[PDB]
């Protein structure tokens, strides 16, 4: 396990603690979010991120941060602003980027 993998696994643990319901834990299904796959072109979730870290697919922190932002942006695009998902996405995007400095 490389130094970048160790750091990313660390950041990921810290980020996932901010989503105690695990709304962002696994790919969003069309069943729970109708028409999701026809709206969101590039889905992302923490489970997929973990698998990318394990596969050594991230070669910079920048790349990891981009997938995190993608996840949050997806939630903010698909959901109306008055929803728990949108509000949590906006909260964790800011907190996560700060956290990661
Ligand atoms: C943040 C990612 N995400 C996750 C979910 C989700 C995943 C697992 C379990 C649950 C549940 F058990 F709590 F329901 C929700 C959902 S569900 C959803 C959905 N059905 N959202 C609607 C909210 C009302 S609206 O904005 O009018 C249309 C979309 C969007 C997302 C999502 O982005």
The domain tally of the chain equals 1
Method: X-ray
Q: How far is the CA of 79 from the centre of ligand 1 (A)?
A: 7
Helix or strand or coil: residue 65? helix
Q: Residue 14, Cβ neighbours under 10 Å: how many?
A: 13
8 Å CB contact between 32 and 70? no
Q: What is the resolution of this structure in A?
A: 1.7
Q: How many helices (H) and strands (E) does the chain have?
A: 5, 0
Which domain, by its residues, includes 81? Answer: 1-101
Q: How far is the CA of 85 from the centre of ligand 1 (A)?
A: 6
DSSP 23-46: TTSSPPPTTTSTTHHHH-SS---H
Residue 100 CB burial class (10 angstroms; 0-12, 13-18, ≥19): middle
Tokens of 8: 């990313």
Question: What CATH number corresponds to the domain at position 24?
Answer: 1.20.920.10
Q: How far is the CA of 33 from the centre of ligand 1 (A)?
A: 5
Q: Residue 28, Cβ neighbours under 10 Å: how many?
A: 20
Tokens of 75: 């939630």
């Amino acid at each position: 396990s490389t130094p970048i993998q160790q750091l990313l696994e660390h950041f990921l643990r810290q980020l996932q603690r901010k989503d105690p319901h695990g709304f962002f834990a696994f790919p969003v299904t069309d069943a729970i979010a109708p028409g999701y796959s026809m709206i969101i072109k590039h889905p992302m979730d923490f489970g997929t991120m973990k698998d990318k870290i394990v596969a050594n697919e991230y070669k910079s922190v920048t790349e990891f941060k981009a997938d995190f932002k993608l996840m949050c942006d997806n939630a903010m695009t698909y959901n109306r602003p008055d929803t728990v998902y949108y509000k949590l996405a906006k909260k964790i995007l800011h907190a996560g980027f700060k956290m990661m400095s």
